[PDB]
Amino acid sequence: HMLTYGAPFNFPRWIDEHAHLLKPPVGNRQVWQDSDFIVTVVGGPNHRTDYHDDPLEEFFYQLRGNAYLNLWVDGRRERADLKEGDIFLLPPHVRHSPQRPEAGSACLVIERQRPAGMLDGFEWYCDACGHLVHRVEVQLKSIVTDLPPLFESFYASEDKRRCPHCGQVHPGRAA
Amino acid sequence: HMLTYGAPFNFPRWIDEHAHLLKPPVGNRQVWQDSDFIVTVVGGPNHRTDYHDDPLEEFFYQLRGNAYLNLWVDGRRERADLKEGDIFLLPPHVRHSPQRPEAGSACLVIERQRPAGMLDGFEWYCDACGHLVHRVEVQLKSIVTDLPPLFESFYASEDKRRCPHCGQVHPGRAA
Ligand SMILES: N=C(C(=O)O)/C(=C\C=C/O)C(=O)O
Ligand SMILES: N=C(C(=O)O)/C(=C\C=C/O)C(=O)O
Ligand SMILES: [Fe+2]
Numbered sequence: 001h002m003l004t005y006g007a008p009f010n011f012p013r014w015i016d017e018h019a020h021l022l023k024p025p026v027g028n029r030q031v032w033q034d035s036d037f038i039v040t041v042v043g044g045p046n047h048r049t050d051y052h053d054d055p056l057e058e059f060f061y062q063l064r065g066n067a068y069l070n071l072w073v074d075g076r077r078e079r080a081d082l083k084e085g086d087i088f089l090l091p092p093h094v095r096h097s098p099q100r101p102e103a104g105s106a107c108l109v110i111e112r113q114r115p116a117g118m119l120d121g122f123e124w125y126c127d128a129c130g131h132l133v134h135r136v137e138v139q140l141k142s143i144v145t146d147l148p149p150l151f152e153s154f155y156a157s158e159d160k161r162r163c164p165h166c167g168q169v170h171p172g173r174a175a
Numbered sequence: 176h177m178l179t180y181g182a183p184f185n186f187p188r189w190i191d192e193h194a195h196l197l198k199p200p201v202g203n204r205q206v207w208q209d210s211d212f213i214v215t216v217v218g219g220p221n222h223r224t225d226y227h228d229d230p231l232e233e234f235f236y237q238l239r240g241n242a243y244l245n246l247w248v249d250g251r252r253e254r255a256d257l258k259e260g261d262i263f264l265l266p267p268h269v270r271h272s273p274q275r276p277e278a279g280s281a282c283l284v285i286e287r288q289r290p291a292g293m294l295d296g297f298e299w300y301c302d303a304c305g306h307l308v309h310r311v312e313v314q315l316k317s318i319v320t321d322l323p324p325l326f327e328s329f330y331a332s333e334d335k336r337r338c339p340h341c342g343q344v345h346p347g348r349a350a
């Protein structure tokens with residue numbers, strides 16, 4: 001039947017043409033709408049303090065510039081570098097916090113639409129003792145409608161930010 | 176928990192290092208094993224006469240060289256060009272026959288593991304009248320174990336190759 005997502009098109013020129021969105025305050029841009037594969041380009045700079053718990057895999061291809069992922073691997077904080085040219089496949093539920101220090105960077109990220117009932121988690125961890133400070137689970141439909149208010153409500157709440165283990169109040173927006 | 180699929184790694188150098196498999200007789204190479212996202216690099220030259228009917232989406236990013244897809248769109252034969260640098264998202268069930276004339280070409284193709292019961296189709300069409308000549312449906316586990324014998328059994332069988340509409344016997348392996 002129909003090429004529902006349109007014809008093939010030149011990706012570098014698309015990234016060039018959307019450079020103004022691959023920077024603060026927007027930072028990323030989904031390529032196709034209403035598809036099963038969620039295909040996004042993510043730019044920079046953006047730093048962030050949440051860890052994502054994705055119930056499905058995520059594919060990364062760092063096309064331009066460098067970035068890295070703060071991870072929880074086997075109970076310990078680790079870093080996975082996404083150097084320019086690198087590809088990477090993240091297994092389900094590995095906690096990850098992408099850090100994207102460079103302007104002009106661009107990373108292809110491919111994920112799957114989550115089926116009804118399969119929820120995403122977003123988590124913050126205590127800088128002092130490492131315990132989990134706060135988790136929100138969300139039926140994720142769009143990283144535009146369902147996600148910013150989630151982060152904003154954490155920054156706005158000393159209670160949400162308060163470590164249950166040691167009482168230290170997480171800093172909120174910037175580490 | 177674990178980085179089950181390993182650390183990030185440089186993709187161009189991987190493609191360089193696997194160049195000897197991105198050519199006849201192998202032609203392609205899956206990047207990671209036992210993952211939900213099936214991530215493959217496909218090289219050339221390869222021409223082929225089957226149309227794939229994939230019950231899920233396929234993502235294409237033609238990294239090196241040029242290729243194209245013969246399609247059935249809205250009842251008519253069409254061609255979608257994959258020029259170097261192009262990306263493309265194919266909707267489910269659009270019949271497609273990839274043609275990869277160039278040596279040294281490389282296309283990133285990402286698909287999903289099909290769940291039990293969701294079958295792939297492989298189809299051949301009559302050059303003369305355009306009617307369907309033969310379809311095989313397969314629970315696809317690997318494009319290495321389940322796929323070559325399927326194609327080989329079509330080439331080996333004048334009966335399978337015989338157009339039901341006009342009686343013309345499809346040529347088999349090479350158009
Ligand atoms: N990989 C993510 C994600 O954490 O799901 C991302 C950007 C937005 C959507 O993927 C990023 O900055 O890499
Ligand atoms: N896109 C395919 C497919 O038809 O599923 C392919 C190679 C092998 C696996 O995808 C190709 O040559 O593009
Ligand atoms: Fe994520």
Ligand SMILES: [Fe+2]
Pocket residue numbers: 126127128129130131163164165166167168
């Ligand atoms: Fe703490």
Ligand SMILES: [Fe+2]
Pocket residue numbers: 227229233271
């Ligand atoms: Fe296919």
Ligand SMILES: [Fe+2]
Pocket residue numbers: 301302303304305306338339340341342343
């Ligand atoms: Fe025919």
